[PDB]
Structure formats: C-alpha cells, structure tokens
C-alpha cells in the first residue's frame, strides 16, 4: 500500500486576523523557549608537494618540471595563505576575553 505521489507545495496554514479599529489583543501569559543554532568557523588545513604528486619517484620527470618556472611556488604560497588564515578564524571567535 505504498507508491510515489506528486502534489503542489503548501505555503502554510491559512489564517485570518480580525482587524478592527477599536479592538486590541493583550497577551495574558508568556513562555520561555531555548533555540539552537550551528555555525562553521574553520576547515581542515592542507599542504601539497610540488613533485611527488606529478612526477612521483621518477628521476627523468622532476628535472624537466623545472622548465615550467615558479608554478608550484605559487601553489605553496596560496595554500599557506589559507592555512594561516584558519588560525585567525578561531582566534577571533573564542578569544574575546
């Protein structure tokens, strides 16, 4: 007795407010509720080797990788910027005292 059905979305239970020009509503009571909320603050740090990924354990590949210039220095420079930044994200949240 199970199947897959397709329908139309519902925006919520319809309500009507009895607006009038000499009527007010005052609450006679209150309640206290606790609500949770989750927020990411940092992600895993990472580092990558220039050559072992590309020319792993090959002597004839690493020498001709140098003809490509300072390419992987930029990768080391960029990934280090992210890594050192992740220490600031945690140092600005919890370290206010």
């Amino acid at each position: 007795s199970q199947s897959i059905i397709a329908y139309t979305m519902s925006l919520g239970a319809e309500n009507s407010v009895a607006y009038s020009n000499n009527s007010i509503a005052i609450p006679t009571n209150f309640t206290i509720s606790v609500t949770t909320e989750i927020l990411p603050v940092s992600m895993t740090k990472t580092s990558v080797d220039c050559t072992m990924y590309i020319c792993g354990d090959s002597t004839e590949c690493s020498n001709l990788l140098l003809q490509y210039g300072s390419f992987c220095t930029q990768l080391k420079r960029a990934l280090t910027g992210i890594a050192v930044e992740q220490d600031k994200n945690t140092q600005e949240v919890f370290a206010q005292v």
Binding site: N22, S23, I24, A25, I26, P27, T28, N29, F30, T31, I32, S33, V34, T35, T36, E37, I38, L39, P40, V41, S42, M43, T44, V93, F94, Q96
Partner: protein, 133 residues
C-alpha cells in the same frame, strides 16, 4: 560579541522572539549557540481608545495602552496583562479633547485623591471638631 556579551535589540538575530541571553558551546570545526528567548503565551482581546478626556482636556498614557473589559477603563503594559487604575501619575495632558478623534469619556483620579480623601476628610473632620463649639 552581541548575543553573548550583551542583550541584542536586533529583531530575529539572536533567536526567534525577544532575546534574553545565550550560551556558547564548542563543536568540531564550528560553534553552537543556545539562544534563550521570551515568547508571549495565550491572549485575550479588549476594547481600546487613544485618549481619555476628563476636565475637557485629552490624556495620554505615559507608558501603556488604554484598555477596557466593558465596564470601566484601565491602563496596562504592552506585552503583559496587568491593569491599573487610571491616575494622573499614569497620564500626561496635551491640549483640549476636541481636535483628537476617537477620544472617549471617563474619570481620572489624581494620586493626591487618597492624599486628600484621607486628609481633606480628616481636615473636614478637624474642621467639624472645632466649628461646633
């Protein structure tokens, strides 16, 4: 900086409702907040008028809103039912009561009324205590 280290006036920022306070909790690669909020419970409707005229002059609530339950009027808090007797301490006067629309008629008893009904009657009792002989 705002929800934990203070109380926030920004609506719908530190929780769904009127904010009270919050508690941090650590978590892997993040933080978790525990917002404590105030939510109004059941309500009852009344009848309201924007100003009250007693001595030909309008009166407005210093803090609060005029309400009635059918017989006589009251002034209460905005977010919690606590009626109080109308008194010159609760109201301030601003002009006559013809320019305003929606004004209604009732009586305002000045806070010196107990300070006179217990004194003027006492003084009248004193006056009758000395005029008779």
């Amino acid at each position: 900086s705002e929800c934990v280290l203070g109380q926030s006036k920004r609506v719908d920022f530190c929780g769904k409702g009127y904010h009270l306070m919050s508690f941090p909790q650590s978590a892997p690669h993040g933080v978790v907040f525990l917002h404590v909020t105030y939510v109004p419970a059941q309500e009852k409707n009344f009848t309201t008028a924007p100003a009250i005229c007693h001595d030909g002059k309008a009166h407005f609530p210093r803090e609060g809103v005029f309400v009635s339950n059918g017989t006589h009027w009251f002034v209460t808090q905005r977010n919690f039912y606590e009626p109080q007797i109308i008194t010159t301490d609760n109201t301030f006067v601003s002009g006559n009561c013809d320019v305003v629309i929606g004004i209604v008629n009732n009586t305002v008893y000045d806070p010196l009324q107990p300070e006179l009904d217990s004194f003027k009657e006492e003084l009248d009792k004193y006056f009758k205590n000395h005029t008779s002989p």
